[PDB]
Amino acid sequence: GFKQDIATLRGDLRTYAQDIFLAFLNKFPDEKRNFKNYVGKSDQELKSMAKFGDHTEKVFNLMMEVADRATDCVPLASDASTLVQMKQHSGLTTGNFEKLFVALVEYMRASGQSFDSQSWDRFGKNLVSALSSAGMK
Ligand code: HEM
């Protein structure tokens, strides 16, 4: 289930973080507007970039904490507020987060592993709702 998936992702987090974030950037190419440093590079090139590895790891470290602190896939309001107020997230809208979780869920469904993809879909929808409640447009 959801709680085991958090453990699975954490057990190989740098790899999952890079592969899911690449799935996001490749499924939604326009999202690179927010990550100009990753324009014009193949996946293998990004996976050799220190900034790419460190960004994706820090993102998924925090995402897994938010997932771990949720109850029944409902995130804490404090975690939603943090994500909205982070200076790095100024100007983002909830659609950006919807797209990240669409890619995450599709990655899980295409994976050979028994991820609880429906729970991650629900978690993403509930996080989007909480971000909106916390003031993200
Ligand atoms: C639950 C989802 C997300 C989490 C947990 C998260 C977390 C983080 C963290 C921890 C950082 C600091 C690492 C760094 O500065 O490189 C960061 C930066 C950033 N995030 Fe997110 N983020 C999420 C979703 C998004 C989405 C959907 C977007 C845009 C589509 C986005 C855009 C950015 C940008 C532009 C930065 C600054 C990157 C840089 O300057 O290197 N984030 N995020």
Tab-separated table of N, CA and C and ligand atoms in Angstrom:
chain	number	residue	atom	x	y	z
A	1	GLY	N	0.821	-1.196	0.000
A	1	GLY	CA	0.000	0.000	0.000
A	1	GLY	C	0.856	1.248	0.000
A	2	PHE	N	0.219	2.373	0.335
A	2	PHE	CA	0.866	3.682	0.303
A	2	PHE	C	2.084	3.729	1.217
A	3	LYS	N	1.943	3.231	2.447
A	3	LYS	CA	3.043	3.321	3.402
A	3	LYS	C	4.239	2.478	2.961
A	4	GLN	N	3.991	1.286	2.402
A	4	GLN	CA	5.086	0.485	1.863
A	4	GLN	C	5.721	1.164	0.656
A	5	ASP	N	4.918	1.833	-0.178
A	5	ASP	CA	5.500	2.509	-1.336
A	5	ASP	C	6.482	3.577	-0.900
A	6	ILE	N	6.173	4.277	0.194
A	6	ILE	CA	7.114	5.270	0.697
A	6	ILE	C	8.439	4.596	1.025
A	7	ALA	N	8.375	3.430	1.684
A	7	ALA	CA	9.590	2.680	1.988
A	7	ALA	C	10.311	2.251	0.714
A	8	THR	N	9.566	1.751	-0.278
A	8	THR	CA	10.192	1.321	-1.526
A	8	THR	C	10.934	2.471	-2.197
A	9	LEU	N	10.246	3.603	-2.379
A	9	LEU	CA	10.890	4.755	-3.006
A	9	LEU	C	12.108	5.209	-2.202
A	10	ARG	N	11.987	5.269	-0.869
A	10	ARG	CA	13.122	5.695	-0.048
A	10	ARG	C	14.311	4.746	-0.163
A	11	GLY	N	14.066	3.459	-0.432
A	11	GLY	CA	15.153	2.492	-0.535
A	11	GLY	C	16.043	2.669	-1.747
A	12	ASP	N	15.587	3.410	-2.750
A	12	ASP	CA	16.388	3.677	-3.936
A	12	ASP	C	16.042	5.080	-4.426
A	13	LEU	N	16.116	6.052	-3.520
A	13	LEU	CA	15.446	7.329	-3.748
A	13	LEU	C	16.102	8.130	-4.869
A	14	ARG	N	17.434	8.142	-4.945
A	14	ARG	CA	18.046	8.940	-6.011
A	14	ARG	C	17.614	8.443	-7.385
A	15	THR	N	17.517	7.122	-7.561
A	15	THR	CA	17.110	6.576	-8.851
A	15	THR	C	15.641	6.870	-9.140
A	16	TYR	N	14.748	6.572	-8.184
A	16	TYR	CA	13.328	6.850	-8.392
A	16	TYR	C	13.087	8.338	-8.592
A	17	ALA	N	13.754	9.177	-7.795
A	17	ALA	CA	13.558	10.616	-7.924
A	17	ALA	C	13.940	11.098	-9.319
A	18	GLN	N	15.106	10.673	-9.807
A	18	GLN	CA	15.513	11.088	-11.144
A	18	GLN	C	14.568	10.528	-12.199
A	19	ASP	N	14.184	9.264	-12.074
A	19	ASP	CA	13.379	8.672	-13.139
A	19	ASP	C	11.969	9.249	-13.163
A	20	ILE	N	11.379	9.527	-11.992
A	20	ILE	CA	10.038	10.103	-11.986
A	20	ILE	C	10.073	11.552	-12.462
A	21	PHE	N	11.087	12.311	-12.047
A	21	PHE	CA	11.171	13.696	-12.488
A	21	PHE	C	11.422	13.777	-13.994
A	22	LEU	N	12.226	12.861	-14.542
A	22	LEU	CA	12.371	12.803	-15.997
A	22	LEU	C	11.053	12.448	-16.672
A	23	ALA	N	10.291	11.516	-16.089
A	23	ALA	CA	8.990	11.188	-16.665
A	23	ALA	C	8.099	12.420	-16.702
A	24	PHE	N	8.179	13.244	-15.654
A	24	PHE	CA	7.432	14.493	-15.588
A	24	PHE	C	7.864	15.465	-16.682
A	25	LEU	N	9.170	15.730	-16.786
A	25	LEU	CA	9.645	16.690	-17.775
A	25	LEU	C	9.393	16.210	-19.195
A	26	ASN	N	9.430	14.896	-19.423
A	26	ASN	CA	9.246	14.403	-20.783
A	26	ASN	C	7.774	14.324	-21.168
A	27	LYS	N	6.889	14.035	-20.211
A	27	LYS	CA	5.460	14.007	-20.515
A	27	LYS	C	4.888	15.410	-20.668
A	28	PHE	N	5.460	16.383	-19.963
A	28	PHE	CA	4.981	17.763	-19.958
A	28	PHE	C	6.146	18.685	-20.290
A	29	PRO	N	6.597	18.675	-21.546
A	29	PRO	CA	7.803	19.442	-21.904
A	29	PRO	C	7.722	20.912	-21.555
A	30	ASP	N	6.524	21.500	-21.562
A	30	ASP	CA	6.421	22.921	-21.262
A	30	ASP	C	6.809	23.234	-19.828
A	31	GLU	N	6.803	22.233	-18.945
A	31	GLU	CA	7.184	22.472	-17.561
A	31	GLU	C	8.650	22.865	-17.422
A	32	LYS	N	9.481	22.589	-18.430
A	32	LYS	CA	10.862	23.055	-18.380
A	32	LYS	C	10.965	24.572	-18.346
A	33	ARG	N	9.880	25.291	-18.642
A	33	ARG	CA	9.867	26.731	-18.403
A	33	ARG	C	10.299	27.056	-16.979
A	34	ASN	N	10.043	26.148	-16.034
A	34	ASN	CA	10.396	26.353	-14.638
A	34	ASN	C	11.784	25.840	-14.279
A	35	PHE	N	12.455	25.112	-15.193
A	35	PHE	CA	13.763	24.504	-14.939
A	35	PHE	C	14.630	24.723	-16.181
A	36	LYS	N	14.980	25.988	-16.438
A	36	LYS	CA	15.695	26.324	-17.668
A	36	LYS	C	17.020	25.575	-17.789
A	37	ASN	N	17.633	25.208	-16.663
A	37	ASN	CA	18.920	24.523	-16.699
A	37	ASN	C	18.831	23.128	-17.300
A	38	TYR	N	17.628	22.582	-17.462
A	38	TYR	CA	17.460	21.229	-17.976
A	38	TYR	C	17.005	21.216	-19.433
A	39	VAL	N	16.919	22.388	-20.065
A	39	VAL	CA	16.567	22.491	-21.477
A	39	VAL	C	17.725	22.005	-22.335
A	40	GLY	N	17.400	21.354	-23.453
A	40	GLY	CA	18.401	20.943	-24.425
A	40	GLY	C	19.308	19.806	-23.997
A	41	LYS	N	18.860	18.947	-23.082
A	41	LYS	CA	19.707	17.870	-22.590
A	41	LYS	C	18.942	16.556	-22.592
A	42	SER	N	19.632	15.470	-22.953
A	42	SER	CA	19.040	14.142	-22.895
A	42	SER	C	18.979	13.654	-21.449
A	43	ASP	N	18.203	12.589	-21.228
A	43	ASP	CA	18.078	12.041	-19.875
A	43	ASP	C	19.442	11.707	-19.282
A	44	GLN	N	20.297	11.025	-20.052
A	44	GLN	CA	21.600	10.630	-19.512
A	44	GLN	C	22.448	11.845	-19.169
A	45	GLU	N	22.325	12.915	-19.956
A	45	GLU	CA	23.034	14.145	-19.629
A	45	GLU	C	22.524	14.727	-18.316
A	46	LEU	N	21.202	14.778	-18.136
A	46	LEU	CA	20.661	15.282	-16.872
A	46	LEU	C	21.113	14.424	-15.691
A	47	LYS	N	21.142	13.106	-15.866
A	47	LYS	CA	21.512	12.223	-14.765
A	47	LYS	C	22.975	12.351	-14.365
A	48	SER	N	23.795	13.012	-15.179
A	48	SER	CA	25.181	13.291	-14.835
A	48	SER	C	25.372	14.678	-14.239
A	49	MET	N	24.325	15.495	-14.203
A	49	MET	CA	24.417	16.865	-13.712
A	49	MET	C	24.202	16.883	-12.208
A	50	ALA	N	25.177	17.451	-11.486
A	50	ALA	CA	25.098	17.539	-10.029
A	50	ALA	C	23.847	18.276	-9.586
A	51	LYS	N	23.505	19.368	-10.272
A	51	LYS	CA	22.346	20.158	-9.869
A	51	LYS	C	21.064	19.357	-10.031
A	52	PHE	N	20.998	18.530	-11.078
A	52	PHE	CA	19.808	17.724	-11.328
A	52	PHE	C	19.626	16.668	-10.247
A	53	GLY	N	20.696	15.939	-9.931
A	53	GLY	CA	20.604	14.943	-8.879
A	53	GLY	C	20.263	15.557	-7.540
A	54	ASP	N	20.852	16.707	-7.227
A	54	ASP	CA	20.606	17.288	-5.913
A	54	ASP	C	19.214	17.900	-5.829
A	55	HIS	N	18.726	18.492	-6.922
A	55	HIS	CA	17.355	18.993	-6.932
A	55	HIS	C	16.362	17.857	-6.758
A	56	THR	N	16.457	16.825	-7.608
A	56	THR	CA	15.457	15.763	-7.541
A	56	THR	C	15.499	15.056	-6.193
A	57	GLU	N	16.691	14.880	-5.617
A	57	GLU	CA	16.751	14.212	-4.318
A	57	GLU	C	16.100	15.051	-3.231
A	58	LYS	N	16.353	16.354	-3.228
A	58	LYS	CA	15.750	17.182	-2.192
A	58	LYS	C	14.240	17.246	-2.349
A	59	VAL	N	13.752	17.309	-3.593
A	59	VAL	CA	12.311	17.298	-3.837
A	59	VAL	C	11.689	16.018	-3.300
A	60	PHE	N	12.266	14.864	-3.656
A	60	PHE	CA	11.629	13.620	-3.251
A	60	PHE	C	11.859	13.296	-1.782
A	61	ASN	N	12.976	13.744	-1.192
A	61	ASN	CA	13.111	13.650	0.260
A	61	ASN	C	11.924	14.317	0.936
A	62	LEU	N	11.605	15.540	0.511
A	62	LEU	CA	10.500	16.253	1.141
A	62	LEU	C	9.165	15.617	0.784
A	63	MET	N	8.973	15.243	-0.487
A	63	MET	CA	7.710	14.620	-0.869
A	63	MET	C	7.438	13.378	-0.029
A	64	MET	N	8.466	12.561	0.209
A	64	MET	CA	8.225	11.354	0.988
A	64	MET	C	7.898	11.684	2.438
A	65	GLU	N	8.494	12.748	2.997
A	65	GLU	CA	8.112	13.168	4.345
A	65	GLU	C	6.659	13.612	4.387
A	66	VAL	N	6.222	14.384	3.382
A	66	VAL	CA	4.832	14.827	3.333
A	66	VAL	C	3.902	13.630	3.215
A	67	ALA	N	4.260	12.665	2.361
A	67	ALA	CA	3.450	11.458	2.238
A	67	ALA	C	3.422	10.686	3.551
A	68	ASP	N	4.575	10.600	4.227
A	68	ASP	CA	4.683	9.849	5.472
A	68	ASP	C	3.868	10.494	6.592
A	69	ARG	N	3.767	11.821	6.596
A	69	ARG	CA	3.005	12.517	7.630
A	69	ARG	C	1.511	12.578	7.346
A	70	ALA	N	1.075	12.180	6.159
A	70	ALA	CA	-0.340	12.172	5.813
A	70	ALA	C	-1.088	11.088	6.590
A	71	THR	N	-2.396	11.288	6.736
A	71	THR	CA	-3.305	10.251	7.209
A	71	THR	C	-4.262	9.919	6.077
A	72	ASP	N	-4.367	8.632	5.727
A	72	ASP	CA	-5.250	8.198	4.637
A	72	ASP	C	-5.044	9.037	3.377
A	73	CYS	N	-3.785	9.335	3.067
A	73	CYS	CA	-3.396	10.087	1.876
A	73	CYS	C	-3.817	11.555	1.929
A	74	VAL	N	-4.137	12.079	3.110
A	74	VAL	CA	-4.484	13.489	3.282
A	74	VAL	C	-3.286	14.187	3.926
A	75	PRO	N	-2.617	15.107	3.237
A	75	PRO	CA	-1.409	15.717	3.804
A	75	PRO	C	-1.749	16.707	4.905
A	76	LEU	N	-0.750	16.969	5.751
A	76	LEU	CA	-0.880	17.996	6.777
A	76	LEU	C	-1.005	19.376	6.146
A	77	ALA	N	-1.869	20.207	6.729
A	77	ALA	CA	-1.959	21.589	6.276
A	77	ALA	C	-0.627	22.317	6.423
A	78	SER	N	0.158	21.982	7.452
A	78	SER	CA	1.442	22.653	7.627
A	78	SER	C	2.383	22.340	6.470
A	79	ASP	N	2.324	21.113	5.946
A	79	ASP	CA	3.175	20.762	4.811
A	79	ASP	C	2.722	21.478	3.547
A	80	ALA	N	1.409	21.605	3.354
A	80	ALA	CA	0.911	22.364	2.210
A	80	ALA	C	1.351	23.821	2.294
A	81	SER	N	1.249	24.427	3.485
A	81	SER	CA	1.661	25.819	3.642
A	81	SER	C	3.138	25.993	3.320
A	82	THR	N	3.977	25.080	3.806
A	82	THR	CA	5.396	25.139	3.479
A	82	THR	C	5.610	25.137	1.971
A	83	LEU	N	4.932	24.231	1.263
A	83	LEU	CA	5.127	24.137	-0.182
A	83	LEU	C	4.660	25.400	-0.902
A	84	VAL	N	3.603	26.050	-0.401
A	84	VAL	CA	3.116	27.264	-1.060
A	84	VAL	C	4.039	28.439	-0.781
A	85	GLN	N	4.585	28.514	0.440
A	85	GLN	CA	5.334	29.689	0.871
A	85	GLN	C	6.803	29.650	0.482
A	86	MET	N	7.340	28.480	0.139
A	86	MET	CA	8.724	28.399	-0.309
A	86	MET	C	8.977	29.406	-1.420
A	87	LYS	N	10.037	30.205	-1.265
A	87	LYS	CA	10.363	31.186	-2.297
A	87	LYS	C	10.544	30.531	-3.663
A	88	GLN	N	11.059	29.297	-3.700
A	88	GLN	CA	11.281	28.640	-4.981
A	88	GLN	C	9.979	28.329	-5.702
A	89	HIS	N	8.853	28.333	-4.987
A	89	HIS	CA	7.561	27.984	-5.560
A	89	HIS	C	6.683	29.194	-5.834
A	90	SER	N	7.225	30.401	-5.739
A	90	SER	CA	6.427	31.581	-6.036
A	90	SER	C	6.013	31.565	-7.502
A	91	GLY	N	4.762	31.932	-7.765
A	91	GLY	CA	4.266	31.948	-9.122
A	91	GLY	C	3.783	30.618	-9.662
A	92	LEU	N	3.950	29.524	-8.930
A	92	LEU	CA	3.409	28.256	-9.392
A	92	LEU	C	1.915	28.184	-9.111
A	93	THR	N	1.221	27.378	-9.906
A	93	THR	CA	-0.197	27.127	-9.714
A	93	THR	C	-0.419	25.634	-9.510
A	94	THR	N	-1.622	25.288	-9.042
A	94	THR	CA	-1.886	23.901	-8.672
A	94	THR	C	-1.738	22.959	-9.858
A	95	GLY	N	-1.974	23.449	-11.075
A	95	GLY	CA	-1.821	22.598	-12.243
A	95	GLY	C	-0.421	22.035	-12.396
A	96	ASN	N	0.595	22.792	-11.977
A	96	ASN	CA	1.954	22.270	-12.035
A	96	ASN	C	2.080	21.022	-11.178
A	97	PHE	N	1.477	21.051	-9.993
A	97	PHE	CA	1.568	19.913	-9.088
A	97	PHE	C	0.719	18.752	-9.580
A	98	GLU	N	-0.459	19.043	-10.145
A	98	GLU	CA	-1.267	17.989	-10.748
A	98	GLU	C	-0.460	17.223	-11.784
A	99	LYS	N	0.263	17.949	-12.641
A	99	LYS	CA	1.027	17.290	-13.697
A	99	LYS	C	2.147	16.424	-13.124
A	100	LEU	N	2.834	16.899	-12.083
A	100	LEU	CA	3.870	16.068	-11.471
A	100	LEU	C	3.286	14.752	-10.969
A	101	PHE	N	2.119	14.801	-10.328
A	101	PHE	CA	1.563	13.559	-9.811
A	101	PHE	C	0.931	12.711	-10.907
A	102	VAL	N	0.446	13.318	-11.994
A	102	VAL	CA	0.012	12.502	-13.124
A	102	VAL	C	1.180	11.673	-13.639
A	103	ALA	N	2.343	12.308	-13.798
A	103	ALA	CA	3.515	11.581	-14.271
A	103	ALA	C	3.959	10.529	-13.260
A	104	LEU	N	3.924	10.867	-11.974
A	104	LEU	CA	4.307	9.906	-10.943
A	104	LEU	C	3.405	8.681	-10.983
A	105	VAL	N	2.093	8.896	-11.088
A	105	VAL	CA	1.156	7.781	-11.100
A	105	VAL	C	1.339	6.937	-12.355
A	106	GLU	N	1.536	7.583	-13.510
A	106	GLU	CA	1.748	6.833	-14.745
A	106	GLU	C	3.050	6.041	-14.689
A	107	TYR	N	4.094	6.622	-14.091
A	107	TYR	CA	5.325	5.869	-13.897
A	107	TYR	C	5.074	4.623	-13.053
A	108	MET	N	4.317	4.764	-11.965
A	108	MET	CA	4.049	3.610	-11.112
A	108	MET	C	3.251	2.540	-11.850
A	109	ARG	N	2.247	2.948	-12.637
A	109	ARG	CA	1.428	1.975	-13.358
A	109	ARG	C	2.244	1.225	-14.405
A	110	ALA	N	3.197	1.905	-15.047
A	110	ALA	CA	4.047	1.278	-16.052
A	110	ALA	C	5.161	0.448	-15.438
A	111	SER	N	5.433	0.644	-14.151
A	111	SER	CA	6.467	-0.099	-13.448
A	111	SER	C	6.041	-1.548	-13.230
A	112	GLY	N	7.027	-2.443	-13.200
A	112	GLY	CA	6.722	-3.829	-12.915
A	112	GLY	C	6.303	-4.102	-11.489
A	113	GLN	N	6.307	-3.090	-10.631
A	113	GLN	CA	6.147	-3.285	-9.200
A	113	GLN	C	4.741	-2.937	-8.731
A	114	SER	N	4.373	-3.518	-7.594
A	114	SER	CA	3.011	-3.414	-7.084
A	114	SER	C	2.847	-2.138	-6.264
A	115	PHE	N	3.180	-1.008	-6.891
A	115	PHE	CA	2.848	0.282	-6.299
A	115	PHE	C	1.337	0.423	-6.167
A	116	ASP	N	0.920	1.133	-5.122
A	116	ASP	CA	-0.496	1.421	-4.903
A	116	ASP	C	-0.830	2.713	-5.649
A	117	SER	N	-0.912	2.591	-6.981
A	117	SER	CA	-1.012	3.790	-7.813
A	117	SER	C	-2.258	4.606	-7.486
A	118	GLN	N	-3.360	3.944	-7.121
A	118	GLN	CA	-4.583	4.680	-6.810
A	118	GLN	C	-4.400	5.572	-5.590
A	119	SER	N	-3.614	5.118	-4.609
A	119	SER	CA	-3.378	5.946	-3.427
A	119	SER	C	-2.532	7.165	-3.771
A	120	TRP	N	-1.548	7.004	-4.652
A	120	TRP	CA	-0.753	8.162	-5.041
A	120	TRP	C	-1.578	9.145	-5.860
A	121	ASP	N	-2.503	8.647	-6.677
A	121	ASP	CA	-3.400	9.557	-7.382
A	121	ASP	C	-4.238	10.353	-6.394
A	122	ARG	N	-4.755	9.675	-5.371
A	122	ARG	CA	-5.566	10.328	-4.355
A	122	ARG	C	-4.732	11.320	-3.561
A	123	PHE	N	-3.521	10.918	-3.183
A	123	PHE	CA	-2.625	11.810	-2.454
A	123	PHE	C	-2.339	13.076	-3.244
A	124	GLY	N	-2.088	12.938	-4.546
A	124	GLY	CA	-1.854	14.115	-5.363
A	124	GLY	C	-3.066	15.026	-5.429
A	125	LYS	N	-4.261	14.446	-5.584
A	125	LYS	CA	-5.465	15.277	-5.599
A	125	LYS	C	-5.656	15.991	-4.263
A	126	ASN	N	-5.446	15.281	-3.152
A	126	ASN	CA	-5.597	15.910	-1.846
A	126	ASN	C	-4.520	16.954	-1.592
A	127	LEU	N	-3.300	16.739	-2.095
A	127	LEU	CA	-2.274	17.765	-1.936
A	127	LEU	C	-2.619	19.008	-2.747
A	128	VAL	N	-3.103	18.824	-3.979
A	128	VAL	CA	-3.569	19.960	-4.770
A	128	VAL	C	-4.657	20.730	-4.026
A	129	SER	N	-5.614	20.014	-3.432
A	129	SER	CA	-6.668	20.683	-2.672
A	129	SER	C	-6.087	21.475	-1.510
A	130	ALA	N	-5.125	20.888	-0.798
A	130	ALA	CA	-4.538	21.561	0.355
A	130	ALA	C	-3.709	22.763	-0.073
A	131	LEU	N	-3.003	22.658	-1.207
A	131	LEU	CA	-2.254	23.803	-1.719
A	131	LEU	C	-3.194	24.955	-2.039
A	132	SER	N	-4.307	24.651	-2.706
A	132	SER	CA	-5.303	25.674	-2.996
A	132	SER	C	-5.821	26.316	-1.713
A	133	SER	N	-6.180	25.488	-0.724
A	133	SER	CA	-6.630	26.018	0.562
A	133	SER	C	-5.584	26.929	1.186
A	134	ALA	N	-4.311	26.601	1.007
A	134	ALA	CA	-3.217	27.389	1.559
A	134	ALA	C	-2.883	28.614	0.716
A	135	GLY	N	-3.585	28.836	-0.391
A	135	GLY	CA	-3.474	30.076	-1.134
A	135	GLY	C	-2.795	29.995	-2.484
A	136	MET	N	-2.444	28.807	-2.955
A	136	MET	CA	-1.885	28.685	-4.291
A	136	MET	C	-2.995	28.822	-5.322
A	137	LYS	N	-2.739	29.624	-6.348
A	137	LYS	CA	-3.717	29.866	-7.398
A	137	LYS	C	-3.801	28.703	-8.383
B	1	HEM	C1	5.118	17.765	-3.813
B	1	HEM	C2	5.771	18.375	-4.807
B	1	HEM	C3	7.056	19.213	-4.627
B	1	HEM	C4	7.952	19.205	-3.632
B	1	HEM	C5	7.972	18.279	-2.397
B	1	HEM	C6	8.963	20.198	-3.935
B	1	HEM	C7	10.065	20.491	-3.159
B	1	HEM	C8	11.080	21.353	-3.511
B	1	HEM	C9	12.328	21.515	-2.793
B	1	HEM	C10	12.695	20.736	-1.509
B	1	HEM	C11	13.064	22.437	-3.440
B	1	HEM	C12	14.476	22.946	-3.064
B	1	HEM	C13	15.498	22.230	-3.950
B	1	HEM	C14	16.087	23.176	-4.978
B	1	HEM	O1	16.002	24.423	-4.781
B	1	HEM	O2	16.642	22.691	-6.009
B	1	HEM	C15	12.295	22.883	-4.588
B	1	HEM	C16	12.690	23.825	-5.510
B	1	HEM	C17	12.000	24.167	-6.659
B	1	HEM	N1	10.761	23.682	-7.035
B	1	HEM	FE1	9.655	22.278	-6.070
B	1	HEM	N2	8.621	20.820	-5.122
B	1	HEM	C18	7.451	20.236	-5.572
B	1	HEM	C19	6.767	20.561	-6.716
B	1	HEM	C20	7.188	21.471	-7.650
B	1	HEM	C21	6.559	21.697	-8.932
B	1	HEM	C22	5.309	20.933	-9.420
B	1	HEM	C23	7.246	22.662	-9.566
B	1	HEM	C24	7.002	23.237	-10.978
B	1	HEM	C25	6.339	22.537	-11.910
B	1	HEM	C26	8.341	23.056	-8.711
B	1	HEM	C27	9.278	24.030	-8.983
B	1	HEM	C28	10.422	24.260	-8.247
B	1	HEM	C29	11.492	25.136	-8.630
B	1	HEM	C30	11.507	25.969	-9.922
B	1	HEM	C31	12.435	25.093	-7.689
B	1	HEM	C32	13.767	25.865	-7.713
B	1	HEM	C33	14.738	24.966	-8.483
B	1	HEM	C34	16.121	25.555	-8.567
B	1	HEM	O3	16.251	26.801	-8.494
B	1	HEM	O4	17.097	24.767	-8.709
B	1	HEM	N3	8.267	22.318	-7.549
B	1	HEM	N4	11.095	22.198	-4.608
